[PDB]
Design a protein around this ligand. Sequence first.
Ligand SMILES: [Cl-]
Lengths: 297, 293
Amino acid sequence: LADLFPGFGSEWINTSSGRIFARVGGDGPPLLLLHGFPQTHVMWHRVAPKLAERFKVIVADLPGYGWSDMPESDEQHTPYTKRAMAKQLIEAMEQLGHVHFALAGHDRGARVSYRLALDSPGRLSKLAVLDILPTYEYWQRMNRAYALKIYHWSFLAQPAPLPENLLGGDPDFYVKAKLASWTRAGDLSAFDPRAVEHYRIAFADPMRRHVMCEDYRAGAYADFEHDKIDVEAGNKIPVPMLALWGASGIAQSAATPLDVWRKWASDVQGAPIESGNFLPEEAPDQTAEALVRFFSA
Amino acid sequence: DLADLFPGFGSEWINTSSGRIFARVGGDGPPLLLLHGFPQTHVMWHRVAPKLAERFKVIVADLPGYGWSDMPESDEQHTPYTKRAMAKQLIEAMEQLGHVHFALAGHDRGARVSYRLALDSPGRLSKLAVLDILPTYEYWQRMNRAYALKIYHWSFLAQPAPLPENLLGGDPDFYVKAKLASWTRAGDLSAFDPRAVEHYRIAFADPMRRHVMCEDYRAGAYADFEHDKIDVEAGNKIPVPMLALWGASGAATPLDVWRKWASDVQGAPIESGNFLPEEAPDQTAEALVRFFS
Ligand SMILES: [Cl-]
């Protein structure tokens, strides 16, 4: 597997829930970057070096993803809920001496990030979420058209071992089709082939695929319920926030993303970027710029 | 080899403009067509067909593209596997036997063929029974988080090819057996005759047969929905005397829903999961015999 972060160090950080793997680079204010599905920390490789010119950049594998440990799940999928992932990543940052930091997340990692902001706003100076609406908002928008357009939220959330067994026969095909289909152009051209190999190797491990299904099971159940409590309480994130999304991604599928986030946060700015669902790879210069500008302000 | 589960029934290949329909044919008296659903074949009727054939001429057909029926070549709109098209093909098949007015009971996908048949060509039917369904339009109208999770396969199997085909190919025996078990009251395969399960497994083992099933669900998400929506908007109701049966463990009651779609409908829950004719054969046969008599 290629080293896509030339000069960055590597850390295996202990937490009560297992080790978090991270690449670490740069210097300055602390900035944690969190990937999503079906990727690993290396999805940040085209923006992390630029960010590292201004920040101490921590590029972490989510709990159970990449090279992070995989805690055993339970009937409520607890370790792969965004609430639990956020707690674990807070522990990991404390191991490095970071008790207040900047955070940008993409996809599942962005879900960890806004949940972190709702549960523990004191931990964050500023927050960026990329290519998402809150989990509650996707489920509220569930109708025939949305069900057909983003089937995998219900598919991967089916009780084990149904999706696990379906994914086993030809995992390469499934993950490569997902990566391609969620891009602007519908192919793999937006990705560094070396990055695709990272994603493919991760997805080739049945234990890693099980974690991804547990992630989506949490997304269908406890994560949704946690979100529901906040929205029905009128709780908003007070942390200064940035929302970025690909204009061809599913966050804007049947919604105006900045309007959605204004329901969830009291100090949020936002913008689209011409891209599918993989902003930091499809539009790295624009993404990196928007992030540097936001976290520097 | 596969077991013969229809003693006294003949085996017929019926010609149509779209391909042969396979059927087991038994009994005498008024004609009654029985239509199965997914992921099964005509053999799911093996426990209630004999009771029915006591009073009726019973035709137990494989749906177009299913079981031993031929597989018509599909198209971009999944036309031959739309319920409108399947109904036209089965009407042609019945005409080959000289049946132009007949009784009809369907289950699951076959029940969707059946109410679509009734909407398009009510003159074909004396009486109609539908087992364990609501109209396709109603399912999609109900498709919120709870339903998206419960009947995920309506969206999964409808994804553009080859996504579901590719996934189903790895271990088809597990998928079909899990579907069969998961939709019963028992949660296992104990409600089924193992010989019937082998019929379902063998059919599902064929990639061409699984592709047909995905085309069926693609039609269900698109053209079938639009056909239903036209009727809903026009206020069209089925005039054919109608019976709706459903499994009690498989919102407005089903009969409340069917009364919006039909002007003469009776109905009853039976303690059962989805597969009424196998989980609750005696009660299903008795209810059908009484209805169709
Ligand atoms: Cl159905």
